């Protein structure tokens, strides 16, 4: 049955083994699905990322197909580009674009972002989301860990491992999926849901960018989820530290009623995003520059 699934994956991935053209694997990152490494392309000297996912170690093995669907069909300026997929023994390997600026998480936990920088990130994420949502793709794991940066401060959405598709025939999803603190209330309440869940999650990531942490981060995951489901929308620790424009923006995101929450396409027209700076404004926040 593991062997059954290896065979299934093989018909869908590129033939061969990327080890034949890649040198110097170094682990840089982690997740639920598996590890992320840097590798050098032997003939060019260029660096790529390689996502390795052990088939035996997945909660829902069939979600590994998400990696291939996104590669094949949904490439975009603000979305991490995937190059090739391979079955290497008991692992799926995805060779993809290396985002050398690292994850938004390292920034969020180590410095304060100004509103020009926050708005830049939000706009980049929302440009991605509005294109994905318009095609029925829901990310389902929006958080700072999923947002990666180039060295010149460009912002890209990654880690599509738990994404899903809605359509006319499948209007809503039902799976309990994501990271507790960032999960939308209707999703925690086990209601059928759609792209709106990404918008809530982004709102939690706005709080990350302001406070350095998502709400109830000091609570156990299961208690946090309960509080998200039962209580009023979570508030900023420091409301005096946001402009009324940023507060207006967040109020459109952290709406409990999914039908009243703003959509990604609506949010692109929000006055708060007018503050967005160029990619260059993000550059000083990175570890190599701080």
């Amino acid at each position: 049955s593991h062997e059954q699934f290896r065979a299934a994956l093989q018909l869908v991935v590129d033939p061969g083994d990327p080890r034949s053209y890649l040198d110097n694997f170094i682990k840089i990152g982690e997740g639920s699905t598996g590890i992320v490494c840097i590798a050098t392309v032997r003939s060019s000297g260029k660096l790529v990322a390689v996502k390795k996912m052990d088939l035996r170690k997945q909660q829902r093995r069939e979600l590994l197909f998400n990696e291939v669907v996104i590669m094949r069909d949904y490439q975009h300026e603000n979305v991490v580009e995937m190059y090739n997929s391979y079955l290497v023994g008991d692992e799926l390997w995805v060779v993809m674009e290396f985002l050398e600026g690292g994850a938004l998480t390292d920034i969020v936990t180590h410095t304060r972002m100004n509103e020009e920088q926050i708005a830049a990130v939000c706009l980049a994420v929302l440009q991605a989301l509005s294109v994905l949502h318009a095609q029925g793709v829901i990310h389902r794991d929006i958080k700072s860990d999923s947002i990666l940066l180039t060295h010149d401060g460009r912002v890209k959405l990654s880690d599509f491992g738990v994404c899903a598709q809605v359509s006319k025939e499948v209007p809503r999803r039902k799976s309990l999926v994501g990271t507790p603190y960032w999960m939308a209330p209707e999703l925690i309440s086990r209601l059928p849901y759609g792209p709106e869940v990404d918008i809530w999650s982004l709102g939690i990531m706005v709080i990350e960018m302001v406070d350095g942490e998502p709400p109830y981060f000091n609570e156990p995951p299961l208690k946090a989820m309960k509080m998200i489901r039962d209580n009023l929308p979570p508030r900023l620790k420091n409301l005096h530290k946001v402009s009324p424009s940023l507060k207006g923006f967040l109020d459109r995101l952290l709406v409990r009623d999914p039908a009243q929450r703003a959509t990604a396409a609506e949010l692109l027209k929000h006055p708060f995003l007018a503050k967005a700076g160029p990619p260059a404004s993000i550059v000083p926040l990175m570890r190599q520059n701080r």
Binding site: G31, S32, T33, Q58, Q59, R60, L63, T105, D141, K143, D145, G161, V162, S175, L176, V177, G178, T179, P180, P221
Partner: peptide, 6 residues
Amino acid sequence: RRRTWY
């Protein structure tokens, strides 16, 4: 904890 659920 920063870990995903399925």
